[PDB]
Amino acid sequence: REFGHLTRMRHVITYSLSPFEQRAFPHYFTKGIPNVLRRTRACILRVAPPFVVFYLVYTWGTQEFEKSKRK
Amino acid sequence: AAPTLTARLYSLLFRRTSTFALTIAVGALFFERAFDQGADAIYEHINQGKLWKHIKHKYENK
Amino acid sequence: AAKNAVSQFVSSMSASADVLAMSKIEIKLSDIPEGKNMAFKWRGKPLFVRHRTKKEIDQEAAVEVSQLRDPQHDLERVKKPEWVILIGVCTHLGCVPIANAGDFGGYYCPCHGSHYDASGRIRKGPAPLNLEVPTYEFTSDDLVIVG
Amino acid sequence: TNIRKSHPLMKIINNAFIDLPAPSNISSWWNFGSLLGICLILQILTGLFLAMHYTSDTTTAFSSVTHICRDVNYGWVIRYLHANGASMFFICLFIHVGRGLYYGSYMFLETWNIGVVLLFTVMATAFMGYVLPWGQMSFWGATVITNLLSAIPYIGTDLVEWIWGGFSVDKATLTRFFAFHFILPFIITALAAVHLLFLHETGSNNPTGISSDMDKIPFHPYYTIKDILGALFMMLILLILVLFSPDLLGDPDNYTPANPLNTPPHIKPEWYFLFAYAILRSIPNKLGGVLALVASILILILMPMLHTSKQRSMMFRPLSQCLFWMLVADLITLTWIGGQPVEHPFIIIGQLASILYFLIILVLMPITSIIENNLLKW
Amino acid sequence: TNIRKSHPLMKIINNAFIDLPAPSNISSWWNFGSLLGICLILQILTGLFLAMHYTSDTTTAFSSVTHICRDVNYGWVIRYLHANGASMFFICLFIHVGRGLYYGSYMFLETWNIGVVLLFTVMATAFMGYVLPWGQMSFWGATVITNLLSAIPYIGTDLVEWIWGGFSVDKATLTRFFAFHFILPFIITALAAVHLLFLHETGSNNPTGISSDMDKIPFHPYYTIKDILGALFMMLILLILVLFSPDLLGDPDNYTPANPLNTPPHIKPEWYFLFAYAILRSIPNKLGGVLALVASILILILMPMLHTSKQRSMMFRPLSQCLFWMLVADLITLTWIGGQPVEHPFIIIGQLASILYFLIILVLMPITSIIENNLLKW
Amino acid sequence: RIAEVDASVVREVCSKYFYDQCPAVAGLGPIEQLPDYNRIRSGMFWLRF
Amino acid sequence: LSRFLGPRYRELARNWIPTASMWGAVGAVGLVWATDWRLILDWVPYINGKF
Amino acid sequence: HLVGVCYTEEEAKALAEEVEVQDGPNEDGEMFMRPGKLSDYFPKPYPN
Ligand code: HEM
Ligand code: HEM
Ligand code: HEM
Ligand code: HEM
Ligand SMILES: COC(=O)N(OC)c1ccccc1COc1ccn(-c2ccc(Cl)cc2)n1
Ligand SMILES: COC(=O)N(OC)c1ccccc1COc1ccn(-c2ccc(Cl)cc2)n1
Ligand code: FES
C-alpha cells in the first residue's frame, strides 16, 4: 500500500489554494453556529432518550432506599 | 543379506512421525525412577557412614 | 528441560516455607487469660485461643440442629473440649470484629448487623458456610502443634 | 538517493508515520489510539519512581506509601500522577472500544482479537496495583476474588495458595502481586507493536464505512499535528486533576490501614471496575459469578460472527444507533449499582441490568440489523 | 498459500531464521553470536530473583545478599548462576570481538559501530552490579572511579555528587547505582535487534574473506542444529562452575564487609576488568589515566580507517597473524599485572605493555599490510 | 481389476510407496531456488497426521 | 444456517476424531508437570515425583 | 539451622534453652527475659 498503487480513477479535477493566500479563520460564527445546531438536531432523538430512563431509575432507586430505613 | 537389530520398531511406531511430536510427554519414562541405579546409589557409596541417614539408628528410640 | 527445570522452580512461592518452623511447632505456652483474644498474626488471621470452662459446651449444645443450615459442633472438629482454634474469616466476605462485644459471647459483626460464634457457627445471613478450622492431630502432654 | 526511502531504519519509520496513506474524513474519535500510547508510556516513567522506594510486606506496606507523599522529594506529585494516570488510561480505553464497536472496526479480525487480549492484560494489571497500598479496600477487594477463585472445582485451592506467597495474608503475598504488576506492563508494549502491524495491512476504517482508496492523504503533516493537539488537551485535564483535586477519584476508607481489625462500612473498588463488581455480586453462587465475570469481557470476540447487516458502520443505521446508546446507559447503571450496598432496590435493579447487557449484544442487535436489511429492499 | 511466506508475522521469522541464505563454510567461531543472546536472556531471568529480595542501603546491603544464600529458598543456586553467568557473558564477548577483528568483519561499518556501543553498555552495567553487594572490593573499586571522574576540570565535582545519592557513602548511593543497573540491560536488548537488522542487508562474512553468493545454504536445518549443540556445551561448562566450584571466579576479600574500617590488603576487580585497571594505574595523573581508559575501548572504531590490505581477512596473511597473537598475549599480561601490587617489577612491565597495546593497532598493523601488498606484486 | 479399487485401497498403496521414502531428483537450470535435499526429504513426512 | 453444512465437513472430522484425543488428552498430559496437579498424580502409583 | 545436620530437633532446643538473652518488652512490665525460642542467632559477647 503505497500512493501510486491504490486504485483506478478517471475524469476528476481538483482545485486548491495555498495556505499563505487564504484566511486561516473564515466564517466562524456566521456559518459555524447554524451548522452545529443542525448536527445537534439530527442526533438528539437517538442519543438522549436512553439517558433519560437512567435518570428516572436513579431517582426511584435512591428514594425507595430511604423509604425503607424510615419508620 | 540378513540385517542387524536396527529395525527397532520402525515399521510399527516410528514411520508416520506420530511418535516424534510427543516424546516430551508419551515417550518420556524409563529415566527418572529407573535411574535409582544412578547418582543416589553412587553418591552414598563414596560417602558411606557420613550422611545423616547413616548415623540415624544411634539417636532414635533411645 | 521439562520437569527438572520447570517444575523444580517450586519451593519459594509455594506452601513450602522459608519459615520452615512457622510458629505452630514453636513451643506455645498460654500467656492468655480467658475472655481475652489477642491479635495473633500467626498464618494470617487472629486464631481464637484462650482458656476453657466446664460450663462452656453447655450453651452451644442448648441450641440444636433445628436452628442451623450446615450442622457441626464442638466434638466433631475439636480434639477435646479444653482447647479452641478458629480463623478470623467470614465465609462470604472475610471478617469478624474485635472480641468482648456480642450477645453473650459471640462476635457481633457491625457491617450491617449480623452475629457469629466463638467456635465457628452460622447465625445470620447472607453467608452460606461455617468457619473453617485448620487440620492437625493430638500427640502430647503440652506439646501443641496447630498444623 | 532520498535517504528516508533507502536507509534500513529510516524507511521503517517513513512507511509507518510519514508517507502512510490515511483517510481524509477521519474524526476526533480516531485520536484515542495514540492517546493510549501516551498514557502507557507515562505509567512506565512514573512506576519507575514508586518501585524504587518501595517495600511490600504485611507489616510495612501501608507506611511505605505514606513515606513518599511527605518525606520522599517530589513524591506527592508523582504518586498522584500514577493514581490518576491509571484513571486516564481507562477512560481512553472505553472510548476506544466503543468507537470500534460503533463503526464496525471489528471486521479487521486479527487487529480486533489482539485488542481483546490487551483489554484483559491491563485489567488484571491494575487489580494487582490497588492491592499493593494495603488499606481496607485493598484487603476486602482482594479477598472476594479468591472466594471465586477457590470455587474452581479441582485446581483452585492450590492455585490461590501458590499466589498468596504460601499461606494467607503474610509478608510474601505482596511479592507475587508485586511481581505480577512490575512485568505485565511490558507484555502490553510488545502486544501493541503486533497490534499495529496487523492494521498496516489494510489501513484505517472511516466514519462512513466505505473504502477510501480514491481519497487518501499523507499522515504527515495532517494527522501528526492533529495528534499533538489532542495530546496537549489530555495533559491539561490530567494536570488539573492532580494539582487541584488529587483525591476526587478515590476512596477515603483506603487511607484506613489494612488489618482484619473490623469489617469496613462498605466494600467498593475504583470506578473502572464497578460495572464488573456489580454483575458477580448479583449472582448467589461463587461459580456462576466467576463465569459471568469472564463472559462480560470475552463476549467481544463474538462480534464478527454476530454481524448480519449489509453495511459496515452505524452511520446510516438509525434503529441500531438507539440500541448502542441503550448499552452505554446500561453500563452507567452498573457503575452506580456497584458502589451501593446490597439492599432491597439494588438487587432487582443490579440483576436485571446484568441480564440486559447480554440480551442486547446476543439477541437484539442481530435481529434489528436483519429488520433494517428488509426495509432497504435487500 | 504457503502460510509461512504470506502471514504478516510468520514471514518476518521465515526471512530471519528459516529461509535465510548463509555461507556453507562457516566455522565454530560464528557460534558465539547466538551464545551472547543466550547469556543475555539468562542474566534477565535470574536478575528477576535477586532484585525481588533486595534492599540497597549502606547499613543493610552486605546482609541483604547473605540472606539469599541461606534463608531464601533456591537462592544459593540462583545467586551463583548470576555471578558466574556474567563471567560467561564476558568470555563470549571477547571471542566475538576477536573473531571480527581477525576476519575483517569490521568492513560491515554500521554493524561494527553498534557493536562498539554494545561493548560500552555491558561494561558499565557490570561495574554497577559489583558495587551492589557492598564489600571491600565494592568500596575501594568504586572510590577509584570517582577520583578520575572528579578530575573532569569543570563539571566533575557536581557530577559525582549527583550520582552518589547526594553526598558520599550513604543510604541513597545504592539507589542510583541500582537504578543504572536494573534498566541498562534492556537498552542492550533493543540495541541487539538493530544490530542484526544491519547485518541482514549483506549476510555473513566467511573465513576466506571472499563473497559466497554462489555457495549459499538455508539456515534451517544446518545452523539451527549447530547452534543448539553449541549452546548445550555452554550450559555444561556453566553448571560445572556453579555446582562444583562456585567461588573460583571471585575474591574472598569481598566477603569481608564494607566500612571505611581499614585499608584492605589489596584492591582488585573481577577478571574481565583487570586489563583496564592495569592501564590507568600505570599513569601517574588522574586526567591522563581517565583518557587512556576510554581510548582503550573506543580505539575499535578506527579499525575500518586503518585498513591497508587488498584482502579482507587474515587467512592468507602470515605476517599479520603473528601480530594478532602478539596482541592477545599483550592482553594476558595486562590481566596478570592488574592483580599484582604496585611494586618495582610490575610498574615497568605494566606501563610498557600499555604502550605496546596502542603501538600494534595504530602503527604496526597498517605498515605490515602494506609490506605484504608489495610482496604479492600489487 | 479397475472395479475393485476404492478409497481405502488407494490410501494403503500410496502409503506403501510414497511416505517415508527417499526420492531421486534431477534438475536443469536456472535452478538456484530448487530446495535443499534435506528440505525435500522432510517434505515426504507430514506434520499433523 | 448452511454455513458449514455438508457430508464433507464431518468426513475429515471422522478420520481425525481418533487423533483428536491428541487435542484433549494431550492437554490432560500437558498439565501434569507444568502445574503439579496434586490429586491426579495418584492417577498412577508410579509418580512419587516430589521427595 | 542445626537440625538434620548434626542434631535432631530435640537435642537441639535444649542447647537453646541454656543461654539467657534479653527479649523485648511487654505491657504491665518492661524489658523481660525469655530464653531460646528455637530460632535465635548465636549470642555476641560485647555490647559495642
Ligand atoms: C494498550 C492498548 C491499545 C493501544 C496502545 C492501541 C493502539 C491503537 C492505535 C495507535 C490505533 C490506530 C489509531 C486509531 O484508530 O486510534 C488503533 C486502532 C484500533 N484498535 Fe487499538 N489500541 C489498544 C487497545 C485496543 C482494544 C482494547 C481494542 C478492541 C477490543 C482495539 C482495537 C482497535 C481497532 C479495531 C483499531 C482499528 C480501528 C479503525 O481503524 O477503525 N485496540 N489502536
Ligand atoms: C499499564 C500500566 C500501569 C497501570 C494501569 C498501573 C496501575 C496502578 C495502580 C492502580 C496503582 C495503585 C495506586 C494507588 O492505589 O494509590 C499503581 C501503583 C503502583 N504501581 Fe502501577 N500501574 C502501571 C504501571 C506500573 C509500572 C510500569 C510499575 C513498575 C515499574 C508499577 C508498579 C507500581 C507500584 C510499586 C505501585 C505502588 C503503590 C503506590 O505507589 O501507590 N506500575 N499502579
Ligand atoms: C550483546 C552483545 C552482542 C550480541 C547479542 C551480538 C549478536 C550477534 C549475532 C547473533 C551475530 C550473527 C552470528 C554471528 O556471526 O555470530 C553477530 C555478528 C556480528 N557481530 Fe555481534 N553481538 C554482540 C556484540 C558485538 C560486538 C561487541 C561487536 C564488535 C565490536 C559485534 C560485531 C559483530 C559483527 C561485525 C558481526 C558480523 C560478523 C560476520 O558475519 O563475520 N557484535 N552478532
Ligand atoms: C547484561 C546483564 C547483566 C550483567 C552483566 C549483570 C552483572 C551482575 C554482577 C557482576 C553482579 C554482582 C554479583 C556479585 O558480585 O555477587 C550482579 C548482581 C545483581 N544484579 Fe545483575 N547483571 C545483569 C543483569 C541484571 C538484571 C536484568 C537485573 C535486574 C532485573 C540485575 C540486577 C542485579 C542485582 C540487584 C544484583 C545484586 C544481587 C547480588 O549481588 O547477588 N542484573 N549482576
Ligand atoms: C483497583 O483495584 C480494585 O478495584 N480492586 O482490586 C484490588 C478491588 C477493590 C475492592 C473490591 C474489589 C476490587 C476488584 O473488583 C473487581 C471486579 C472485577 N475485577 C476484575 C479484576 C481483574 C480482571 Cl482481569 C477482571 C475483573 N476486579
Ligand atoms: C565488577 O566490578 C568491578 O570490577 N569493579 O567495580 C565495582 C571494581 C572493583 C574494584 C576495583 C576496580 C573496579 C572497576 O575497575 C574498572 C576498571 C575499568 N573499569 C571500567 C568500568 C566501566 C567501564 Cl564502561 C569501563 C571500564 N572498571
Ligand atoms: S458478616 Fe460478612 S456479610 Fe454479614
Coordinates of C-alpha atoms in Angstrom, one line a residue, chain E residues 101-107 205-210 303-304 306-321 368-378:
Chain E
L101 CA 39.0 -8.3 14.1
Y102 CA 40.7 -11.4 12.7
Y103 CA 38.4 -12.0 9.7
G104 CA 37.9 -8.3 8.8
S105 CA 34.2 -8.2 9.7
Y106 CA 34.6 -4.5 10.7
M107 CA 34.1 -3.7 7.0
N205 CA 31.3 -12.9 6.2
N206 CA 33.1 -16.2 6.0
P207 CA 36.7 -17.4 6.9
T208 CA 38.1 -17.0 3.4
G209 CA 37.2 -13.3 3.1
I210 CA 35.6 -13.9 -0.4
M303 CA 39.7 -0.2 12.5
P304 CA 37.9 0.5 9.2
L306 CA 43.4 1.9 9.4
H307 CA 42.9 -1.0 6.9
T308 CA 45.5 -1.0 4.1
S309 CA 45.4 -4.6 2.8
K310 CA 44.0 -5.6 -0.5
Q311 CA 42.4 -8.7 1.1
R312 CA 39.7 -8.7 3.7
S313 CA 40.5 -11.4 6.3
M314 CA 43.7 -12.8 7.8
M315 CA 43.5 -16.4 6.4
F316 CA 46.2 -15.7 3.7
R317 CA 48.3 -13.1 5.7
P318 CA 51.0 -14.9 7.7
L319 CA 52.8 -11.7 8.8
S320 CA 49.6 -10.2 10.2
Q321 CA 48.7 -13.4 12.0
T368 CA 52.7 -4.7 7.8
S369 CA 49.7 -4.9 5.5
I370 CA 51.5 -2.5 3.0
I371 CA 54.6 -4.7 3.1
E372 CA 52.5 -7.8 2.3
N373 CA 50.9 -5.9 -0.5
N374 CA 54.3 -5.3 -2.1
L375 CA 55.3 -8.9 -1.8
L376 CA 52.3 -10.2 -3.7
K377 CA 53.2 -7.8 -6.7
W378 CA 50.2 -5.5 -6.2

